[PDB]
Amino acid sequence: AEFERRKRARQINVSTDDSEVKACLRALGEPITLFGEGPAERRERLRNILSVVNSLKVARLWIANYSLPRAMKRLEEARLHKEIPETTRTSQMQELHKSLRSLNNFCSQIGDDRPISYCHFSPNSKMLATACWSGLCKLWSVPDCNLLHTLRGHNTNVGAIVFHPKSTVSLDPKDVNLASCAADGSVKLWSLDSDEPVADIEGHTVRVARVMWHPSGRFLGTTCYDRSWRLWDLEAQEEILHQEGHSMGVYDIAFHQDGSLAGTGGLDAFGRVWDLRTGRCIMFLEGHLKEIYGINFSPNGYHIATGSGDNTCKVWDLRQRRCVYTIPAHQNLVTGVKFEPIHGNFLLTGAYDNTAKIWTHPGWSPLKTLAGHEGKVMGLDISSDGQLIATCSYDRTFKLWMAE
Amino acid sequence: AKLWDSKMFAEIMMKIEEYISKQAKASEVAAPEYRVIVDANNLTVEIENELNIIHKFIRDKYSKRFPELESLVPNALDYIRTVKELGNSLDKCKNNENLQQILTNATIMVVSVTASTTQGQQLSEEELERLEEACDMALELNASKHRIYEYVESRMSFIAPNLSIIIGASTAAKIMGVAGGLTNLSKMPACNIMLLGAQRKTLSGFSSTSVLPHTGYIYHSDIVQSLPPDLRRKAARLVAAKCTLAARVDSFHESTEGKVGYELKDEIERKFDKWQEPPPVKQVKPLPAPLDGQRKKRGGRRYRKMKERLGLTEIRKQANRMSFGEIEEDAYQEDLGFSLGHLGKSGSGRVRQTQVNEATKARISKTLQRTLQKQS
Amino acid sequence: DVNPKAYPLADAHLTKKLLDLVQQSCNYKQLRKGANEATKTLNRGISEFIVMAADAEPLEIILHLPLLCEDKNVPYVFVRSKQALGRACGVSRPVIACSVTIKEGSQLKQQIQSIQQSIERLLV
Amino acid sequence: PLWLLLSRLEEKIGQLTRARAILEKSRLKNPKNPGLWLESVRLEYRAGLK
Amino acid sequence: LGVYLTKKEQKKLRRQTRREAQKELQEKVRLGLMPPPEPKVRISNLMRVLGTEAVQDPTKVEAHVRAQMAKRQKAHEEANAARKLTAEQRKVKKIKKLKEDISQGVHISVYRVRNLSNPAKKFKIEANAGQLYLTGVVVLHKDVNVVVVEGGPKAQKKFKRLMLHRIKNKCVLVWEGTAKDRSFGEMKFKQCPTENMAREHFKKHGAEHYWDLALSESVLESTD
RNA sequence: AGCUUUGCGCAGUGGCAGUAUCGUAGCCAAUGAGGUCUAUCCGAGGCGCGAUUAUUGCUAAUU
């Protein structure tokens, strides 16, 4: 009877929104509000009713003209190294291996009272730039850890600061020397004599993770979280290529020492090797699971290494256009992957495992674990001389390593 | 050896930074002004940590003369002023001297009474000279601290624009100085901020309620003190919470206009008005109409227990019976006519005395039992 | 979207895991609600990790918690909702910051360690 | 005791960063030791890095 | 994206559901669809309920009271047992909760043990990996014992705890990480007297780098 | 394969207290309710209003 109808009414789900109740009542044609009918009585009535019922082309041409001779020269350098007796190459190989295994924590300096997100060696291997989350970038002398020229920095956390390739060697200190990226996307240029930014590159409305110059020193590569990476031309003072190829945010960008290629490693878990001369994705990295947080083109010119959250460091061969070896480096998220700047002497890896490891570039076997620190190793860099290793960390300190 | 030696360095640094502060004040009316504020607010901490050391030294030195004054006067500045005023001669008419400004009248009579029976020997002339030197140094440090607080209060519209709106610049200056910095203030819970500047004032034969305990600068702020005393605790708590929010906003240099501060002050004023809101109209409950109809009431365990409790007991049944012609003797002076009746008297008919019914035993309320458990 | 000031923001899966762990901690009497109690736990070093919301307005009222976490070496994470975080804590009122305390011998220790490892590798 | 004494020498030598590195290496080689932690904390406190 | 409920919310829900059920039962009784409830009687309640009837027929009243109590107990047992997980259904729930979704990714841990001669330890590793769906391989050498274990994060954590505390020469975690896809099957415990064919077997699955790391770490430990 | 922890239901048995149990399209509340003690410490509901045999039903009597 009607008791069963009342039982049915209880089981009927009716929206608790007054506007939705009024809309449902009007849809059925019944009066929206009776006299003295509040929202609760309206809901009860609804329940009962329901129960009843051209610069790009010029830049590309310049990059090609700059890169082709360098690629050729690298080719004859490799041919000459092949002509070198195998005994000499082997001997210098174990000399390098013995030198690496003797590395010790040379120094330990508090960069700032906040975690240090990046560290970069100057081209003359005498100055070190550290990027901090406090919004301050600092320049440190390499042989002795002491602050020499602080920077006012950004307002948010600073992602990465990279020296100009010709800085401290050829161009004047008052010119552009450094490019720093922040957590708000702002990119600011710096000079070795002015604490305030020389210039403020704009256009990145979203956070940019890494910023690095082209080896020619004329183009600056920025990677945003807009699934995009941008190339900024210093001479033109305007971004050139806002390439959109990553499915997710783009974290790291690595340039080719020849200058012909550029590699972008993003949160898409896949990497892409764009062609700076033609603007087409020549080779598409695949195999990494989870976001890739590191990438660096080897000075050899045909090897690429990438570090991701898989606790792995995959080495990619450009000649075969495929991965060659997967290095299971560290037991936590890998961030910094970098080869020896001069040649393929070794591979340096850093991760959130508060440790760094060294691997032979050809053999991909461990040599020395740079154990130390007490916080996650955010970034690392090797000096152009090759015997200097700097590893910033979450421990608010950066450390130097030289053979002893 | 150490405190005296460090006193000169502290004074020199304070003088240099106070000259810097005066230069900044003149310039306002690349050495930015924020660093000056940071230096002054660190100077406040340094001055406090030197003044407490000086107060401890004076307390140790003066304890030979009048050892009991430390307990009577817990405040450091009041202790220093009192030992300066009294000096070696306790009974030197200083009681009706400036002590009335230093201390409350009740504690003045307390300290005079205690000094009447000091049982403490006089101090040597070198001990004297050292005591007045320490007192003068402490007073100079207090004056420097007052100058620094004045300068910081003059610049509270920039360092903490939001927190200035709520409690004003003076209370802002006091809480920022006692907290050790705006950053230190932000990294602090609202409960601790409410107790900033609180003093463990001695109660001289009074309840702890009379001498307001756990009350700090915020409790004595203008907005909190404007409420009736029965609502000032809630006012202090709410204002302290909103001031903590503003300080956290201010330490990141956000809402420099004061929009957060204005919103928080408006919320505080609305809550204060709600507390001051007049009570609503409440209907008068009429007397229930007398009723003679039969009413059916359930039985069971509850009814059985109530019947057992309220029911007549043999001890009470026997006390209601009074013998006829057996003129008993008065057993209670304070109330005549009172009698035990047949209890323990001849003619009761019972050889053995009736036992006490345990169902009539006294028991306390459930809420009262909860309060007693909480008190434990 | 969300305030960029809350950079260590958890995704949906980690948000669900964090809310489940917060509810379990509340059931085990191992949780502290509110930014003030989170600050108190951080100052006393009895906090496993701090979960705070990204909808706090203004967000600067809890941005001091990451600094205290860095000082005390305690993981911290940002959740996208202050209403779901409050519900996870067992309180109908929104909660913008909750702290999971340290209790020796607690059966939640393994889950707490797993969540700490997940959070500490997500900030960047 | 060899570790902390060498670190104290490095502090006295004037190269405090080398003392920091030595203490960090000592803590790495001897995990969870209050003795090395105490000296490491005192090193920053005595250097003004409160 | 589920929303949790406060204890007051739970109390309100339970109270209002019980009140609705009680009102429905009372309406059914009053309407005549349900007989009125007989008083609940126990042994201590026997006289208070039927003293007049208990005097005339003590054993009959006792039998009636015990019959009512046994009816209540039987109803309770029938409710409990009716709603009981079948023995096979208990396994199905257990066999599913331990089956993590490796579609997103597989977690791989590599272990190196100095000695693995004990057959009981071999059986422990094999059974624990099989129950936890931890597909992998065990390669036995003179010193190197590569234990590649792949599966779900919960199983990986349990198995790591297994050899770290439950099972004892020492056990060292070489590398714990994730990969896109699995590369080994069930436990096989391959015997590898020499390094060359062990490396070849690891290359068959495409995971020779685990063997390389284990061998290099063992060599470094031996030199140390 | 067993064992066991927490929370939520559903029942069973047992104990205790009826000066208390509920209701909240009323208000306030972890952006802190409320603080006699321990206050640079405590951390959750409070208040107002309403219902009542200090939870509410049947059953049996007299009526």
JSON list of N, CA and C in Angstrom, two decimals, chain A residues 357-404:
[
{"chain": "A", "resi": 357, "resn": "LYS", "atom": "N", "xyz": [77.66, 9.02, -8.55]},
{"chain": "A", "resi": 357, "resn": "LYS", "atom": "CA", "xyz": [78.40, 7.87, -9.03]},
{"chain": "A", "resi": 357, "resn": "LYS", "atom": "C", "xyz": [79.10, 8.21, -10.34]},
{"chain": "A", "resi": 358, "resn": "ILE", "atom": "N", "xyz": [80.21, 7.51, -10.59]},
{"chain": "A", "resi": 358, "resn": "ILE", "atom": "CA", "xyz": [81.04, 7.72, -11.77]},
{"chain": "A", "resi": 358, "resn": "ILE", "atom": "C", "xyz": [81.09, 6.42, -12.55]},
{"chain": "A", "resi": 359, "resn": "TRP", "atom": "N", "xyz": [80.84, 6.50, -13.86]},
{"chain": "A", "resi": 359, "resn": "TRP", "atom": "CA", "xyz": [80.82, 5.33, -14.72]},
{"chain": "A", "resi": 359, "resn": "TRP", "atom": "C", "xyz": [81.72, 5.58, -15.92]},
{"chain": "A", "resi": 360, "resn": "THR", "atom": "N", "xyz": [82.46, 4.55, -16.32]},
{"chain": "A", "resi": 360, "resn": "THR", "atom": "CA", "xyz": [83.22, 4.62, -17.57]},
{"chain": "A", "resi": 360, "resn": "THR", "atom": "C", "xyz": [82.26, 4.86, -18.72]},
{"chain": "A", "resi": 361, "resn": "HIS", "atom": "N", "xyz": [82.53, 5.88, -19.52]},
{"chain": "A", "resi": 361, "resn": "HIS", "atom": "CA", "xyz": [81.64, 6.18, -20.64]},
{"chain": "A", "resi": 361, "resn": "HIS", "atom": "C", "xyz": [81.52, 5.02, -21.63]},
{"chain": "A", "resi": 362, "resn": "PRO", "atom": "N", "xyz": [82.61, 4.37, -22.09]},
{"chain": "A", "resi": 362, "resn": "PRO", "atom": "CA", "xyz": [82.43, 3.22, -22.98]},
{"chain": "A", "resi": 362, "resn": "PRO", "atom": "C", "xyz": [81.81, 2.01, -22.30]},
{"chain": "A", "resi": 363, "resn": "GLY", "atom": "N", "xyz": [82.36, 1.62, -21.15]},
{"chain": "A", "resi": 363, "resn": "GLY", "atom": "CA", "xyz": [81.95, 0.38, -20.51]},
{"chain": "A", "resi": 363, "resn": "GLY", "atom": "C", "xyz": [80.73, 0.47, -19.62]},
{"chain": "A", "resi": 364, "resn": "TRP", "atom": "N", "xyz": [80.42, 1.68, -19.14]},
{"chain": "A", "resi": 364, "resn": "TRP", "atom": "CA", "xyz": [79.27, 1.91, -18.26]},
{"chain": "A", "resi": 364, "resn": "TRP", "atom": "C", "xyz": [79.35, 1.05, -17.00]},
{"chain": "A", "resi": 365, "resn": "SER", "atom": "N", "xyz": [80.55, 0.96, -16.43]},
{"chain": "A", "resi": 365, "resn": "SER", "atom": "CA", "xyz": [80.76, 0.25, -15.18]},
{"chain": "A", "resi": 365, "resn": "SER", "atom": "C", "xyz": [81.16, 1.23, -14.08]},
{"chain": "A", "resi": 366, "resn": "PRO", "atom": "N", "xyz": [80.72, 1.00, -12.84]},
{"chain": "A", "resi": 366, "resn": "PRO", "atom": "CA", "xyz": [81.02, 1.95, -11.77]},
{"chain": "A", "resi": 366, "resn": "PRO", "atom": "C", "xyz": [82.51, 1.99, -11.45]},
{"chain": "A", "resi": 367, "resn": "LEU", "atom": "N", "xyz": [83.00, 3.19, -11.14]},
{"chain": "A", "resi": 367, "resn": "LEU", "atom": "CA", "xyz": [84.37, 3.39, -10.71]},
{"chain": "A", "resi": 367, "resn": "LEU", "atom": "C", "xyz": [84.45, 3.89, -9.28]},
{"chain": "A", "resi": 368, "resn": "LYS", "atom": "N", "xyz": [83.79, 5.01, -8.97]},
{"chain": "A", "resi": 368, "resn": "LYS", "atom": "CA", "xyz": [83.81, 5.59, -7.64]},
{"chain": "A", "resi": 368, "resn": "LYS", "atom": "C", "xyz": [82.45, 6.20, -7.35]},
{"chain": "A", "resi": 369, "resn": "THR", "atom": "N", "xyz": [81.88, 5.84, -6.20]},
{"chain": "A", "resi": 369, "resn": "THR", "atom": "CA", "xyz": [80.63, 6.43, -5.74]},
{"chain": "A", "resi": 369, "resn": "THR", "atom": "C", "xyz": [80.97, 7.64, -4.88]},
{"chain": "A", "resi": 370, "resn": "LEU", "atom": "N", "xyz": [80.58, 8.82, -5.34]},
{"chain": "A", "resi": 370, "resn": "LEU", "atom": "CA", "xyz": [80.87, 10.04, -4.61]},
{"chain": "A", "resi": 370, "resn": "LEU", "atom": "C", "xyz": [79.96, 10.14, -3.39]},
{"chain": "A", "resi": 371, "resn": "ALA", "atom": "N", "xyz": [80.14, 9.22, -2.44]},
{"chain": "A", "resi": 371, "resn": "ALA", "atom": "CA", "xyz": [79.30, 9.19, -1.26]},
{"chain": "A", "resi": 371, "resn": "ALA", "atom": "C", "xyz": [79.56, 10.41, -0.39]},
{"chain": "A", "resi": 372, "resn": "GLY", "atom": "N", "xyz": [78.52, 10.85, 0.29]},
{"chain": "A", "resi": 372, "resn": "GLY", "atom": "CA", "xyz": [78.57, 12.06, 1.08]},
{"chain": "A", "resi": 372, "resn": "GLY", "atom": "C", "xyz": [77.21, 12.71, 1.11]},
{"chain": "A", "resi": 373, "resn": "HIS", "atom": "N", "xyz": [77.21, 13.99, 1.49]},
{"chain": "A", "resi": 373, "resn": "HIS", "atom": "CA", "xyz": [75.99, 14.79, 1.56]},
{"chain": "A", "resi": 373, "resn": "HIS", "atom": "C", "xyz": [75.00, 14.23, 2.57]},
{"chain": "A", "resi": 374, "resn": "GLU", "atom": "N", "xyz": [73.93, 14.97, 2.83]},
{"chain": "A", "resi": 374, "resn": "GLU", "atom": "CA", "xyz": [72.84, 14.48, 3.66]},
{"chain": "A", "resi": 374, "resn": "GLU", "atom": "C", "xyz": [71.48, 14.79, 3.05]},
{"chain": "A", "resi": 375, "resn": "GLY", "atom": "N", "xyz": [71.45, 15.42, 1.87]},
{"chain": "A", "resi": 375, "resn": "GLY", "atom": "CA", "xyz": [70.20, 15.69, 1.19]},
{"chain": "A", "resi": 375, "resn": "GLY", "atom": "C", "xyz": [70.31, 15.32, -0.27]},
{"chain": "A", "resi": 376, "resn": "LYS", "atom": "N", "xyz": [69.16, 15.36, -0.94]},
{"chain": "A", "resi": 376, "resn": "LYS", "atom": "CA", "xyz": [69.08, 14.95, -2.34]},
{"chain": "A", "resi": 376, "resn": "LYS", "atom": "C", "xyz": [70.00, 15.81, -3.21]},
{"chain": "A", "resi": 377, "resn": "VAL", "atom": "N", "xyz": [70.79, 15.15, -4.06]},
{"chain": "A", "resi": 377, "resn": "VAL", "atom": "CA", "xyz": [71.73, 15.83, -4.95]},
{"chain": "A", "resi": 377, "resn": "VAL", "atom": "C", "xyz": [70.93, 16.34, -6.14]},
{"chain": "A", "resi": 378, "resn": "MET", "atom": "N", "xyz": [70.65, 17.65, -6.16]},
{"chain": "A", "resi": 378, "resn": "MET", "atom": "CA", "xyz": [69.83, 18.21, -7.23]},
{"chain": "A", "resi": 378, "resn": "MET", "atom": "C", "xyz": [70.60, 18.31, -8.54]},
{"chain": "A", "resi": 379, "resn": "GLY", "atom": "N", "xyz": [71.84, 18.76, -8.49]},
{"chain": "A", "resi": 379, "resn": "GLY", "atom": "CA", "xyz": [72.57, 18.99, -9.73]},
{"chain": "A", "resi": 379, "resn": "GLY", "atom": "C", "xyz": [74.06, 18.82, -9.53]},
{"chain": "A", "resi": 380, "resn": "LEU", "atom": "N", "xyz": [74.77, 18.77, -10.66]},
{"chain": "A", "resi": 380, "resn": "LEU", "atom": "CA", "xyz": [76.21, 18.57, -10.66]},
{"chain": "A", "resi": 380, "resn": "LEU", "atom": "C", "xyz": [76.79, 19.15, -11.94]},
{"chain": "A", "resi": 381, "resn": "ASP", "atom": "N", "xyz": [78.09, 19.39, -11.91]},
{"chain": "A", "resi": 381, "resn": "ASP", "atom": "CA", "xyz": [78.80, 19.87, -13.09]},
{"chain": "A", "resi": 381, "resn": "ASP", "atom": "C", "xyz": [80.27, 19.49, -12.97]},
{"chain": "A", "resi": 382, "resn": "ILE", "atom": "N", "xyz": [80.91, 19.29, -14.12]},
{"chain": "A", "resi": 382, "resn": "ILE", "atom": "CA", "xyz": [82.33, 18.99, -14.20]},
{"chain": "A", "resi": 382, "resn": "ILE", "atom": "C", "xyz": [83.01, 20.13, -14.94]},
{"chain": "A", "resi": 383, "resn": "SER", "atom": "N", "xyz": [84.13, 20.59, -14.40]},
{"chain": "A", "resi": 383, "resn": "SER", "atom": "CA", "xyz": [84.84, 21.72, -14.99]},
{"chain": "A", "resi": 383, "resn": "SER", "atom": "C", "xyz": [85.44, 21.34, -16.34]},
{"chain": "A", "resi": 384, "resn": "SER", "atom": "N", "xyz": [85.74, 22.37, -17.14]},
{"chain": "A", "resi": 384, "resn": "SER", "atom": "CA", "xyz": [86.36, 22.14, -18.44]},
{"chain": "A", "resi": 384, "resn": "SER", "atom": "C", "xyz": [87.71, 21.46, -18.30]},
{"chain": "A", "resi": 385, "resn": "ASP", "atom": "N", "xyz": [88.41, 21.68, -17.18]},
{"chain": "A", "resi": 385, "resn": "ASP", "atom": "CA", "xyz": [89.66, 20.98, -16.94]},
{"chain": "A", "resi": 385, "resn": "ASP", "atom": "C", "xyz": [89.44, 19.49, -16.73]},
{"chain": "A", "resi": 386, "resn": "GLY", "atom": "N", "xyz": [88.31, 19.11, -16.13]},
{"chain": "A", "resi": 386, "resn": "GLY", "atom": "CA", "xyz": [87.93, 17.72, -16.00]},
{"chain": "A", "resi": 386, "resn": "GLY", "atom": "C", "xyz": [88.30, 17.04, -14.70]},
{"chain": "A", "resi": 387, "resn": "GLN", "atom": "N", "xyz": [89.09, 17.69, -13.84]},
{"chain": "A", "resi": 387, "resn": "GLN", "atom": "CA", "xyz": [89.44, 17.12, -12.55]},
{"chain": "A", "resi": 387, "resn": "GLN", "atom": "C", "xyz": [88.66, 17.76, -11.40]},
{"chain": "A", "resi": 388, "resn": "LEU", "atom": "N", "xyz": [87.67, 18.58, -11.72]},
{"chain": "A", "resi": 388, "resn": "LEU", "atom": "CA", "xyz": [86.85, 19.27, -10.72]},
{"chain": "A", "resi": 388, "resn": "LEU", "atom": "C", "xyz": [85.41, 18.80, -10.84]},
{"chain": "A", "resi": 389, "resn": "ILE", "atom": "N", "xyz": [84.84, 18.35, -9.72]},
{"chain": "A", "resi": 389, "resn": "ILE", "atom": "CA", "xyz": [83.46, 17.89, -9.67]},
{"chain": "A", "resi": 389, "resn": "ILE", "atom": "C", "xyz": [82.75, 18.63, -8.55]},
{"chain": "A", "resi": 390, "resn": "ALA", "atom": "N", "xyz": [81.62, 19.25, -8.88]},
{"chain": "A", "resi": 390, "resn": "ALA", "atom": "CA", "xyz": [80.80, 19.97, -7.91]},
{"chain": "A", "resi": 390, "resn": "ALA", "atom": "C", "xyz": [79.41, 19.36, -7.89]},
{"chain": "A", "resi": 391, "resn": "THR", "atom": "N", "xyz": [78.89, 19.12, -6.68]},
{"chain": "A", "resi": 391, "resn": "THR", "atom": "CA", "xyz": [77.58, 18.49, -6.50]},
{"chain": "A", "resi": 391, "resn": "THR", "atom": "C", "xyz": [76.80, 19.27, -5.44]},
{"chain": "A", "resi": 392, "resn": "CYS", "atom": "N", "xyz": [75.88, 20.12, -5.89]},
{"chain": "A", "resi": 392, "resn": "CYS", "atom": "CA", "xyz": [74.95, 20.77, -4.97]},
{"chain": "A", "resi": 392, "resn": "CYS", "atom": "C", "xyz": [73.90, 19.77, -4.50]},
{"chain": "A", "resi": 393, "resn": "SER", "atom": "N", "xyz": [73.29, 20.07, -3.35]},
{"chain": "A", "resi": 393, "resn": "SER", "atom": "CA", "xyz": [72.36, 19.12, -2.75]},
{"chain": "A", "resi": 393, "resn": "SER", "atom": "C", "xyz": [71.29, 19.86, -1.97]},
{"chain": "A", "resi": 394, "resn": "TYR", "atom": "N", "xyz": [70.28, 19.09, -1.53]},
{"chain": "A", "resi": 394, "resn": "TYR", "atom": "CA", "xyz": [69.27, 19.56, -0.60]},
{"chain": "A", "resi": 394, "resn": "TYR", "atom": "C", "xyz": [69.84, 19.89, 0.77]},
{"chain": "A", "resi": 395, "resn": "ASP", "atom": "N", "xyz": [71.06, 19.45, 1.06]},
{"chain": "A", "resi": 395, "resn": "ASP", "atom": "CA", "xyz": [71.77, 19.68, 2.31]},
{"chain": "A", "resi": 395, "resn": "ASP", "atom": "C", "xyz": [72.21, 21.12, 2.49]},
{"chain": "A", "resi": 396, "resn": "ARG", "atom": "N", "xyz": [71.81, 22.02, 1.60]},
{"chain": "A", "resi": 396, "resn": "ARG", "atom": "CA", "xyz": [72.17, 23.44, 1.61]},
{"chain": "A", "resi": 396, "resn": "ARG", "atom": "C", "xyz": [73.66, 23.66, 1.38]},
{"chain": "A", "resi": 397, "resn": "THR", "atom": "N", "xyz": [74.40, 22.63, 0.98]},
{"chain": "A", "resi": 397, "resn": "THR", "atom": "CA", "xyz": [75.84, 22.73, 0.77]},
{"chain": "A", "resi": 397, "resn": "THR", "atom": "C", "xyz": [76.21, 22.14, -0.58]},
{"chain": "A", "resi": 398, "resn": "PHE", "atom": "N", "xyz": [77.27, 22.68, -1.16]},
{"chain": "A", "resi": 398, "resn": "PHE", "atom": "CA", "xyz": [77.88, 22.12, -2.36]},
{"chain": "A", "resi": 398, "resn": "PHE", "atom": "C", "xyz": [79.29, 21.64, -2.03]},
{"chain": "A", "resi": 399, "resn": "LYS", "atom": "N", "xyz": [79.71, 20.56, -2.68]},
{"chain": "A", "resi": 399, "resn": "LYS", "atom": "CA", "xyz": [80.98, 19.93, -2.39]},
{"chain": "A", "resi": 399, "resn": "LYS", "atom": "C", "xyz": [81.82, 19.83, -3.66]},
{"chain": "A", "resi": 400, "resn": "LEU", "atom": "N", "xyz": [83.14, 19.88, -3.47]},
{"chain": "A", "resi": 400, "resn": "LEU", "atom": "CA", "xyz": [84.09, 19.74, -4.56]},
{"chain": "A", "resi": 400, "resn": "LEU", "atom": "C", "xyz": [84.88, 18.45, -4.40]},
{"chain": "A", "resi": 401, "resn": "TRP", "atom": "N", "xyz": [85.24, 17.85, -5.53]},
{"chain": "A", "resi": 401, "resn": "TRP", "atom": "CA", "xyz": [85.96, 16.59, -5.54]},
{"chain": "A", "resi": 401, "resn": "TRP", "atom": "C", "xyz": [87.16, 16.69, -6.47]},
{"chain": "A", "resi": 402, "resn": "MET", "atom": "N", "xyz": [88.35, 16.42, -5.94]},
{"chain": "A", "resi": 402, "resn": "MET", "atom": "CA", "xyz": [89.55, 16.29, -6.75]},
{"chain": "A", "resi": 402, "resn": "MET", "atom": "C", "xyz": [90.34, 15.08, -6.28]},
{"chain": "A", "resi": 403, "resn": "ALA", "atom": "N", "xyz": [91.09, 14.49, -7.21]},
{"chain": "A", "resi": 403, "resn": "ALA", "atom": "CA", "xyz": [91.89, 13.32, -6.88]},
{"chain": "A", "resi": 403, "resn": "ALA", "atom": "C", "xyz": [93.00, 13.67, -5.90]},
{"chain": "A", "resi": 404, "resn": "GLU", "atom": "N", "xyz": [93.19, 12.82, -4.91]},
{"chain": "A", "resi": 404, "resn": "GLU", "atom": "CA", "xyz": [94.22, 13.03, -3.90]},
{"chain": "A", "resi": 404, "resn": "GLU", "atom": "C", "xyz": [95.08, 11.78, -3.72]}
]
